[PDB]
Symmetry: C3
Subunit: 173 residues, 3 copies
């Protein structure tokens, strides 16, 4: 992909990870196995680290950043929806970050959680496992259903396949 | 522009269409006559197709995508505002997709419609012709005025001219 | 960076300004001293001018544009948050444009002002100095505190340092 290293920090990207050449990864950024960074996404690891767990995907026009003392940590089987923005937050496993939504500094998102599209999780907000978050400021509206809890993973699995699909069949023309 | 083809699918772009080299078009994507894809926009046609009708424009940092069974179809004289995101939705003719707004899967937008900036049209939401949509979840608040109905087209026409302006006078330095 | 000139108009960029090669600057755009345009940001100066004052930063996946008669003017010590969008608005000094927020045409933002993340300042909206704006449509909710008024500047100063950090230690790999 389009990768840079800043000063001492250099990105650590597992070989099976997919990173679109139109995406931008800078500095201290960790990308685990079968992860994916899509077209025009930006992972700027120029102060605290940006860690992305396995089977996790960062969609298009998404931006990920941090603040002094607030690094961004993403768990496994996590989806970061198109045009979303995560700034110095901690996200657990099996989580869907809605499209064009915003997760702010100090935020702690639990596992098996869905954040609604366009939602804004306030700074230092703690979201319990199995929660559906909506609104601005975003808030827990109810617990996930079995079908949504199943989706919290399938969506990530779908992207693992997509990533592989681009690694092998993508071709510039 | 920055165009890729994935597996069997290759983008079909009318000669008069404008596609910024900083934009990204992937796979099964159709771009009709005098259409325009602007800087940093992303049209990822890696599962269902992304179809864009005539005199339609996809502005900067915009992302367009789909889901299995939910392809994205854009009509004519349609504006997709800066930083907006359209995912597997059907949009009619003469429509203004507001800036940083979101249109979700299964959504059916009628003709001569304006979607407010930052608005979020829920999944499978059907928006009647001549409607002004606002909020999150977005909802019809009132019918378009004659002046807005005139704007639903002029805005697209303005971009057709802009596109031509870049095709002829744009120059990298 | 990735800079283009359109027709007669060519970007005027102070030597100390930082412009990521993944960012896009087009046409009539002015970037003052120690300013910064970050990864994937877009400053399209293809109708009215886009002016950016000193110590100001335009973060990732941000889009800045204008409309006929409505040029975009950004003051000094101004932060334009990740994924935000400014369209033909006038912004004063010491202002924080929240993440994924939207500032529309005709808007007049005063000095020492903070716009909440995901907020949408309506067209022609005038925001008084020292205000905290929230919601959609965005509105003044209360006046800034001394700590926030101090932050209105520190945040910009932090980026001036960051910019310098990339200019000297950034390296593609
Ligand atoms: Ca972008
Ligand atoms: Zn930041
Ligand atoms: Zn998607
Ligand atoms: Zn525009």
């Amino acid at each position: 992909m389009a990768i840079y290293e800043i000063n001492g920090k250099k990105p650590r990207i597992h070989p099976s990870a997919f990173v679109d050449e139109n995406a931008v990864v800078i500095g201290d950024v960790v990308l685990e196995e079968k992860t994916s960074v899509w077209p025009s996404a930006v992972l700027r690891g120029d102060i605290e680290q940006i860690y992305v767990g396995k089977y996790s995907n960062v969609q298009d026009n998404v931006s990920i950043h941090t603040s002094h003392g607030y690094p961004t940590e993403i768990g496994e089987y996590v989806t970061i929806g198109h045009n979303a923005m995560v700034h110095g937050a901690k996200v657990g496993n099996y989580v869907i970050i809605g499209i064009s939504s915003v997760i702010l500094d100090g935020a702690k998102i639990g596992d098996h959680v869905i954040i609604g599209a366009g939602a804004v999780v306030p700074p230092n907000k703690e979201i319990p496992d199995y929660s559906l978050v909506l609104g601005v400021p975003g808030k827990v509206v109810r617990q996930l259903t079995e079908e949504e809890i199943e989706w919290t993973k399938k969506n990530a699995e779908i992207y693992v396949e997509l990533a592989e699909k681009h690694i092998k069949g993508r071709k510039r023309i």
